[PDB]
Amino acid sequence: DPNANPNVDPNANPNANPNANPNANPNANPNANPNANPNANPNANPNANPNANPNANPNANPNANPNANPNA
Amino acid sequence: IQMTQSPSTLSASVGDRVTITCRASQSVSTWLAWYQQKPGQGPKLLIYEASSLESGVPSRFSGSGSGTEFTLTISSLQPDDFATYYCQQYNSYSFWTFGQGTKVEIK
Amino acid sequence: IQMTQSPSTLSASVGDRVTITCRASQSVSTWLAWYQQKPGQGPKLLIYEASSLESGVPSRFSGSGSGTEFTLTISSLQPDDFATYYCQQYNSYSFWTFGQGTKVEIK
Amino acid sequence: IQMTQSPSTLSASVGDRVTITCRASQSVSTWLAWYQQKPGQGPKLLIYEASSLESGVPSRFSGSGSGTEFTLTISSLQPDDFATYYCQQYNSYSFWTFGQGTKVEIK
Amino acid sequence: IQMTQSPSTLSASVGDRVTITCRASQSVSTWLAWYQQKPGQGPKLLIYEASSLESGVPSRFSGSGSGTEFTLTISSLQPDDFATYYCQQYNSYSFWTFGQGTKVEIK
Amino acid sequence: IQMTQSPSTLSASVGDRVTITCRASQSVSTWLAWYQQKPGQGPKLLIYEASSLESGVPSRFSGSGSGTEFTLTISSLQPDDFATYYCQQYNSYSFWTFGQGTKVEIK
Amino acid sequence: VQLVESGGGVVQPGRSLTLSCAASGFTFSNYGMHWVRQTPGKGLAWVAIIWYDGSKTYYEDSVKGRFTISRDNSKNTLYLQMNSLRVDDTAVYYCARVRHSSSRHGSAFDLWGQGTLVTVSS
Amino acid sequence: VQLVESGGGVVQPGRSLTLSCAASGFTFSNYGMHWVRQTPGKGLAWVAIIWYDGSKTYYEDSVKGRFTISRDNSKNTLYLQMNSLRVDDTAVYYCARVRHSSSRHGSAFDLWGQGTLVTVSS
Amino acid sequence: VQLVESGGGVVQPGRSLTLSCAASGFTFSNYGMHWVRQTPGKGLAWVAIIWYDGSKTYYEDSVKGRFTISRDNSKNTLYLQMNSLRVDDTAVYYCARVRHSSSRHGSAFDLWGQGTLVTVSS
Amino acid sequence: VQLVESGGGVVQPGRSLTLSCAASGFTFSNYGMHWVRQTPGKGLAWVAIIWYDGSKTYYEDSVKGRFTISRDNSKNTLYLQMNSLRVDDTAVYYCARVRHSSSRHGSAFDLWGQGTLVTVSS
Amino acid sequence: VQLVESGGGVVQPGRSLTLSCAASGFTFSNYGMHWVRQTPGKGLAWVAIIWYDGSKTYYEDSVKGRFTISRDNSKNTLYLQMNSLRVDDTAVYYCARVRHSSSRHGSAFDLWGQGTLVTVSS
Amino acid sequence: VQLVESGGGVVQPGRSLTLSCAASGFTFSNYGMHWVRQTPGKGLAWVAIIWYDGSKTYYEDSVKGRFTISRDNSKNTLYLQMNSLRVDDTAVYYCARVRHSSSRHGSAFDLWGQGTLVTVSS
Amino acid sequence: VQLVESGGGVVQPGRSLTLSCAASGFTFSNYGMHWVRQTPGKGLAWVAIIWYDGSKTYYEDSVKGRFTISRDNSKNTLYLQMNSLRVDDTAVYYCARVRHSSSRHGSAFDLWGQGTLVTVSS
Amino acid sequence: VQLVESGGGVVQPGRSLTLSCAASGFTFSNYGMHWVRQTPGKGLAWVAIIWYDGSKTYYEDSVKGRFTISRDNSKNTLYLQMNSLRVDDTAVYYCARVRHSSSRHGSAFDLWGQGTLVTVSS
């Protein structure tokens, strides 16, 4: 039937269509998403981070520390 | 995302009703914000996410819409509110772009 | 993010089965914790991440759920489990908020 | 989604018009890309989304089509444009597959 | 983080190519190190940050990986290199845990 | 931490504007310094902490930057400002290193 | 399962007015909705439809180019932004929810709102 | 409401030429389209029809197997690619839009483009 | 790969029971999963669905509002909180995984669990 | 391990009151801490946070600019200093220790003090 | 809570000019800030973004390789080092502060500076 | 911008080989990268993808469990650790950078390397 | 670069034994040290860390409150004092020197001692 | 404020040379000094640091064990005892004084000597 209304059938089902592919969509956008929240993340780990550099900090203030114990 | 606003110049009087239409060349979902830049100053945010009001904004301002058609409605125009209004979109994977700006002038 | 718990009052007897349900107005993923505040004391953590058990808490207590629906289940109510149980959420960019809490009474 | 290109090998002279047809086994909407691999080098993008040009590509290249029929047309073949062209599809729920590729030889 | 290695025992001869696989129960980014303990002695560092080589170690030893899959590849097994190799992780907020050790044996 | 300075030689005239760029192979936060060594003398500090000015230096010298990109800006070149400028970094756990040094000559 | 609208009032001809519709008690992001008038002295009349995503919209032949319909799935809202009103638009505007149907043809309007009166006069 | 064709020119017999057709001023994704040729000395002649999605196509018996019609709803364009052009295909190609009809039988062609001249000669 | 449930038992009518479903051997955060009942004397019956993210759920018409299906991608589990249990709900519950499909229409349930028995009686 | 508060009492509105929170039995200089209110007739409410060093600090939006939280790692002690106390601010204040988490996303409040009572009245 | 820039002036094409932006009244190290131009005869145009740490930077496609934005949380100061200036860049440059959002999708620019005028001419 | 691999050579069947891919001239931690074979006498074939974090990964159906791809954003490298090589795996392996797209459907591979020859034979 | 342990032997359960670790050939007071157990039949297991000054120490969960690690920068020695030993704690004890790292994330253990066997039995 | 060195000259490889550095005009006992080399054709290179009392020193990796830096606060004089010189070690040696800093992270080298020549050849 070449002659059949090729328009959209406006009276269609506009609902949610429960049978849609619920999988992961492996072809997506794997990039940086530049419009992402550029803020401080208040819920970050406020603890001590035990696995931190326990070394000597070779670049530290080698000066005289003028505010030191001036007593015996 | 090309963003355009109409009408470019909107004459209105004190106490009148004002509507400014912002159209996006692509679907920006609900990510859109409205600004206000009086001459010689820096723009001040009024509406974010196209519906919510920023803290300190008078209750007169309101906005609505989604997709590609957004409008900003001033229920009662005050002598304060005569300034240039800008429309911004920040979609998910799109960068921030601004509209040309409509200027509200005394009638 | 507003957290509400139902039922607010839950009568139960010794050896019964008790379920307390916490609902989040916005998706809080798996970030949720349950507390227990006997009157006159300070609340003690029972469940973190909505599933795990804090060290020292008896195996009776358990929790399940994700998204916006959560539930704390007690497999066997004991004489010292009659206290107010609270709900907390600590999402990515949301601050810590507590529910109003449900009180368990003897039947 | 199996993608085949025809003709496998075509000879064209300098300044001639060249058309390469890529046919998809199933509809791939408009997600499709055309490549170019000179011998011993790495393939370079020419056309993405089946119509748009990658930045830096001369306006000589052109591509059109949708559904299961795609073509790449070189308006005026140049001495530099003699290489093998590959057809790639990346549908929404399908993986990336490449056509066999056609070799453009000097007449 | 529970750290596991594979294979538990590996037979190889002089001049062969040996790969030892270390797999993490949780993501450890690129923080990982490979040791070598000859019987009766103390383990010696070979690879730190899972890719770089400790000073003085022969260029035979190499490693790669990130996340939860790590490998240690020896391009030419010498009579020196018959010893047990351990996998350590030191994540950001995690403590130090070691693998069970794979022993390279003469064939 | 490899430090590189560009451009190596910068011809300029009296009263011009000279900008020297210092780039760090890794992030050195705001710990950086700029020196000036006239031929046959010992270098003297100009800028420390990448922004502040040493006592007694003319107000012409200025610098800015943080992370990996640092620049030194001379508002008005003077006839005693034709000398070699060096870039130094002293990060937290990194040692002191110097750049190759650019020579500002008379145009 | 409650549907309430807002944004009514009386405006002079030629002005722009925006209506709204609040959805609660059901998953609003799963249903395509409608806007329906009820002019006294006449029956109901369809006005606009939104296709569950904002992808497709359709209008009555007499409001094309003046009435725009859009929805915010995050706030569970509908908007019928009306431009260049006439006296013929004096009516009560309802929201309608299209019932779930196991076909490709849609269903009738199952849940109706209460309605906001919009009057255009000089 | 604007519909513009492009891509015309002069080619040798046996070559391949593709055409383009851009739609503006109306939603292009909601209309099926036709391509109609105009040979000087003859009347209008139908060529191909696209079913609003590319899902169904039909061709004239004279160009079956050599003509491909496809549409890109994301850019509001039509594509009629001609393969193995002959001298008899020398005509002006028009885009036609099927008007909305409240039935299942379709309707006439509402909007026509200005057309582009495609000639084949030696 | 494997898919094992737990949390079954016998509870009185009206009580609340929580089921679990641990998935191993594959990337669990990639698949939308289902819960399926098996009442003896009747064929299998569908119960709920989780949309690979927890964003979308759809329930059987007889368990809407009494069953809550939710998933945790971090610990590779499923949960089906069952409230207001009745004597009818005595059935074996299965987990199901939706097969990868190269379309927009989903696929069948390939990986099924061993099932847990839930009994409601007085 | 023991955590007890102190410094509460009764003050007039508009005055300033300071609370202290002595931690004992554990390494205090390793934990980020909080302050939590419990108003009778309401649930627990979060007040402030201190980031294990004094480096970062966040407050509830109703106490910004009136409450100052600071810690003294050498004495194992917290301090929340109240300025311009109002009638609203009458509640019981608890210190909360953030649980150790093997990730970057913090954890729940495990060790809670016995709390102190702050009363603001005229 | 104020945000003021400096460093503007008149420079010849090809010369490098550096801008600064001092933030006061709020914790500056918690916010990712933007630089925005306002060319007379045009609307606002985005320039660069700094990601609260200096870890990530994105630029407008017309300034890549000539503009370097870097921040200093220790002194509460932004920098936009502009290299190889051209006559196009004559515009007023604004600082912008990104609003806190309870999500991962960002938010609008609430705090804007007063603008520093940059003129590039011979 | 530049993208150069390494680690090629000749190994016997059953042995393991690890390839590397160093990225220079662009920000590597923002792009999801691919690996593509090219067997002589056959066209290109996709192998694996890495999701810009290492969080998600996908492989060709014939290399699942034998090829493991992982990236090190701190040093701008890729690693396709190949285990249990076969005579089939004789090919040239390329790296690919996924072009930025202002959508959620990804884009094509815009930056390709020069490839390393991997030969498996005895 | 030498690192020698000492203090090993045989003790009855519940008794206290103290180890030492004499460093030689390098600046002992510049490095943070670890103690690592090796129980035959298992891999290495961590015990304690000392933070280059005695300021911070962290222990394994199974030895907290019974093992007290301390260092003496003046004589270049470590000390792991054990109290209330059990039959579990029989192993070989190694010292470990944390490698210098140009960052804040620590590094691996480069220099290991030869170890002294500690036997707990009756 | 002056810094003058001496003790340079020309010696054959394998010998030992001792440099000095006399400070005047300021309290030399308050300052941790550095030694810095300048080899023509190359930029400055750091050599050694002395920590204001002799507690800590750090050397460049290429001069460890051959250069011994020391100071004498009673004579305001540095000492760099050089042993086993090589043809590499010819350059100009500068003293550097570390600028006073109001923090713990050090500062730049503010006062520099006039440099001395150390030449090594056969």
Author numbering:
A (entry chain I): 2 to 73
B (entry chain L), C (entry chain P), D (entry chain N), E (entry chain R), F (entry chain T): 2 to 95, 95A, 96 to 107
G (entry chain C), H (entry chain A), I (entry chain E), J (entry chain O), K (entry chain H), L (entry chain M), ...: 2 to 52, 52A, 53 to 82, 82A, 82B, 82C, 83 to 100, 100A, ...
Quoted passage from the original study:
Many malaria vaccine candidates, like RTS,S, are based on P. falciparum circumsporozoite protein (PfCSP), which is the primary surface antigen of P. falciparum sporozoites, the stage of malaria parasites infectious to humans. The structure of PfCSP comprises three domains: (1) a flexible N-terminus, which contains a heparin sulfate binding site for hepatocyte attachment; (2) a central repeat region composed of 25 to 40 major (NANP) repeats, which are interspersed by a few, N-terminal minor repeats (NVDP, NPDP); and (3) a small, structured C-terminal domain. Cryo-electron microscopy (cryo-EM) reveals a remarkable spectrum of helical antibody-PfCSP structures stabilized by homotypic interactions between tightly packed fragments antigen binding (Fabs), many of which correlate with somatic hypermutation. In each complex, CSP displays some form of helical structure that is stabilized by homotypic interfaces between tightly packed Fabs bound along the length of the NPNA repeats.
Each of the extended helices in complexes with 337, 334, 311, 356, and 239 are right-handed, while the partial, disc-like helices of 364 and 227 display left-handed curvature. The extended helical structures of CSP in the 337, 334, and 239 complexes are each unique, i.e., non-superimposable. As previously shown for 311, the tight helical packing in the complexes of mAbs 334, 337, and 356 creates a secondary homotypic interface between Fabs separated by about one helical turn (3 or 4 NPNA2 epitopes). Homotypic interactions consist mostly of polar contacts within apposing heavy and light chain framework regions (FRs). In general, the secondary homotypic interface contributes about half of the total BSA relative to the primary interface. Strikingly, however, the reverse is true with 334, where the total BSA of the secondary interface is roughly twice that of the primary, suggesting a critical role for framework region residues in the stability and/or formation of this complex. Key contacts within the secondary interface are also linked to somatic hypermutation of the germline heavy and light chain genes. In HFR1E of 334, a mutated residue T19 appears critical for the interface and mediates a key hydrogen bond with S65 of LFR3B. While there is a range in the level of inhibition, many antibodies are highly potent and have statistically indistinguishable protection relative to mAb 317, namely mAbs 356, 311, 334, and 364.
